Amino acid sequence: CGLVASNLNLKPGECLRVRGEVAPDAKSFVLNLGKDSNNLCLHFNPRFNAHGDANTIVCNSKDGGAWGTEQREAVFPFQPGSVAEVCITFDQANLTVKLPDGYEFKFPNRLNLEAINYMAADGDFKIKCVAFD
Amino acid sequence: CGLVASNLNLKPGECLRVRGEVAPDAKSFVLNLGKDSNNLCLHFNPRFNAHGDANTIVCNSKDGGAWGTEQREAVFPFQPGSVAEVCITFDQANLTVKLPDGYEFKFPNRLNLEAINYMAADGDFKIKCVAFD
Ligand SMILES: Nc1cc(Cl)c(S(N)(=O)=O)cc1S(N)(=O)=O
Numbered sequence: 001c002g003l004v005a006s007n008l009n010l011k012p013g014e015c016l017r018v019r020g021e022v023a024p025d026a027k028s029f030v031l032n033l034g035k036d037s038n039n040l041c042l043h044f045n046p047r048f049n050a051h052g053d054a055n056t057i058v059c060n061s062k063d064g065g066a067w068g069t070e071q072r073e074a075v076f077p078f079q080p081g082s083v084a085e086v087c088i089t090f091d092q093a094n095l096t097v098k099l100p101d102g103y104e105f106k107f108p109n110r111l112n113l114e115a116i117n118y119m120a121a122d123g124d125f126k127i128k129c130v131a132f133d
Numbered sequence: 134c135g136l137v138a139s140n141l142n143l144k145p146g147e148c149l150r151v152r153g154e155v156a157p158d159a160k161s162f163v164l165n166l167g168k169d170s171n172n173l174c175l176h177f178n179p180r181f182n183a184h185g186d187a188n189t190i191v192c193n194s195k196d197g198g199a200w201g202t203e204q205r206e207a208v209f210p211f212q213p214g215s216v217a218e219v220c221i222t223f224d225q226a227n228l229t230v231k232l233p234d235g236y237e238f239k240f241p242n243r244l245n246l247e248a249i250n251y252m253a254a255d256g257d258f259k260i261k262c263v264a265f266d
Contacts, residue, residue: 001140002140003138003139003140003141004138004139004140005136005137005138005139006136006137006138007134007135007136007137008136127265128264128265128266129262129263129264129265129266130262130263131261131262131263132260132261132262133261
């Protein structure tokens with residue numbers, strides 16, 4: 001169970017940059033972002049080998065404690081036992097997740113959140129640096 | 134209230150770096166480090182002009198809700214309307230706080246925490262970057 005942070009006060013268009021170490025035995029890691037632990041506009045879950053998925057990013061939302069429908073992504077620029085940085089911005093319509101090696105995707109902001117105040121990391125990812133601008 | 138982070142798992146000898154923006158009319162700011170809001174190995178409180186103090190760093194501990202004996206440090210290398218970084222490490226005997234302009238001081242480690250797991254920021258300091266290394 002990894003870093004939990006609150007009172008982030010991230011506003012639309014502002015960049016949240018997260019750099020960490022992907023464990024050498026990595027199977028899965030998670031970054032959760034939202035209003036609080038029950039209201040997530042982004043559950044970001046790269047699965048190296050987990051829950052039947054191989055090298056697939058799965059995203060979801062959580063609204064008032066209820067998980068939404070999982071969305072699978074098309075790119076996977078992560079390797080076990082490496083450093084990786086993710087950069088996230090949002091607006092009320094979409095989150096934009098920028099990944100290593102120039103990859104990126106958008107995920108709809110199902111909560112239409114105008115501020116992100118909560119982040120939590122879990123799984124095979126050791127955070128080394130968080131930046132807010 | 135500003136950023137609150139938990140599960141930091143900062144081990145002895147590891148460096149926590151915190152960079153932020155000091156408000157142009159700053160009066161004071163606080164970084165609290167420890168186990169939780171009731172158990173702080175370091176309450177670090179630069180006062181530009183607050184509580185009768187001028188350009189003085191006030192430090193203390195808090196153990197089971199009880200404030201310890203305050204200490205006041207010798208140097209004040211902070212300026213309103215600037216960017217400032219602090220860097221903190223600890224061993225069993227002391228926390229070492231490294232300040233802008235190369236200044237550093239030690240504060241006794243009065244608690245027996247195996248790791249620093251909690252940070253909370255308050256006051257006239259906007260955190261821009263936190264690094265765990
Ligand atoms: N400023 C703004 C304008 C529009 Cl139009 C939209 S929307 N409705 O296309 O998502 C969102 C925003 S923001 N930056 O608050 O998320």
